[PDB]
Amino acid sequence: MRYIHSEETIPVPENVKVSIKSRLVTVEGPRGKLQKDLSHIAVNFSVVKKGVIGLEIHHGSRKDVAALRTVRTIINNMIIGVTKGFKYKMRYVYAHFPINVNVEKNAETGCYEVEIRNFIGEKIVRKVVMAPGVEVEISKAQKDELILSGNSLEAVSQSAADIQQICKVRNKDIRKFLDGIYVSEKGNIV
């Protein structure tokens, strides 16, 4: 069955600018500006109402109709990122060897860099480079906590996932060796 018409709606807040041209969505807000290329998905964009963006698919199958929900959630995440932002709090815990975390900002590339030392007494220095637009700070309110903030949810969550996966324990019982850096909180900056 091909469905003749299907549509979705995305509300836009008052202080948010949205510009779509050739399925290239640019969303600007108080916190910055984001872009996303959605040219791989067949969708007709329109302005159905003042402050509401309409998404239409004509003569589409169930798969094509279902893709519009993903497009809606992606654009809503961009809007939330430029309005409130995204923040991931991570905790690093240890048993014997204290994990040393150093955060620097590379001046030439403009990206943050996280260096991890003394992970279960290892002599190697782990280096993980954040996605651009993601800021990392060592928290002062809580013990052994990093805070990753940004406008792109995908970039923030992927940077958190890279830091989590760089400190992997190998050839040890994970019921006994509990050392690592884990995502402890997800939310908005505002």
Partner 1 sequence: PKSKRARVYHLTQVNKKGREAKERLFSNIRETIPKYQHCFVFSVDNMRNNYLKDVRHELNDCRIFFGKTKLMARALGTTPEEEQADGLHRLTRYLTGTVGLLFTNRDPADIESYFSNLSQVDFARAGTVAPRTVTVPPGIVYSTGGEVPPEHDVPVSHTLEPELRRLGMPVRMIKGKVCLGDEKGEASEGYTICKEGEVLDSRQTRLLKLFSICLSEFKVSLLGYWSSASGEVTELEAGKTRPKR
Partner 2 sequence: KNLGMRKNGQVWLPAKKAFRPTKGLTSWELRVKKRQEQAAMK
Partner 3 sequence: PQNEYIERHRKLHGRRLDAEERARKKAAREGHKNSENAQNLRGLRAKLYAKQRHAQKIQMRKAIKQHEERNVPSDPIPSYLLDRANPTTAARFSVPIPKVRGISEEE
DSSP 96: S
Please tell me the distance from the alpha carbon of residue 47 to that of residue 9, in angstroms, as a whole number: 9
Other residues' Cβ atoms within 10 Å of the Cβ of residue 114: 22
Choose which of 17, 49, 59, 69 interacts with partner 2 (CB under 8 A): 69
Q: How far is CA 180 from the centre of its chain?
A: 21
Residue 76 lies near partner 2 (rule: CB under 8 A): yes
User: Interaction with partner 3 in 71-110: which residues (CB under 8 A)?
Assistant: 91, 93, 95
Which of 37, 21, 167, 156 has the alpha carbon at shortest distance from 94?
167
User: Interaction with partner 1 in 92-151: which residues (CB under 8 A)?
Assistant: 93, 141-143, 145
Of 92 and 119, CB closest to partner 1: 92
Residue 3 lies near partner 2 (rule: CB under 8 A): yes
Please tell me the distance from the alpha carbon of residue 44 to that of residue 55, in angstroms, as a whole number: 6
User: Interaction with partner 2 in 130-169: which residues (CB under 8 A)?
Assistant: 153
Residue 66 lies near partner 3 (rule: CB under 8 A): no
* CA dihedral of residues 188, 15, 35, 46 (deg, nearest 10): 120
Contact residues for partner 1 (CB under 8 A)?
91, 93, 141-143, 145, 184-185
Contact residues for partner 3 (CB under 8 A)?
91, 93, 95, 164, 173-176, 178, 180, 182-184
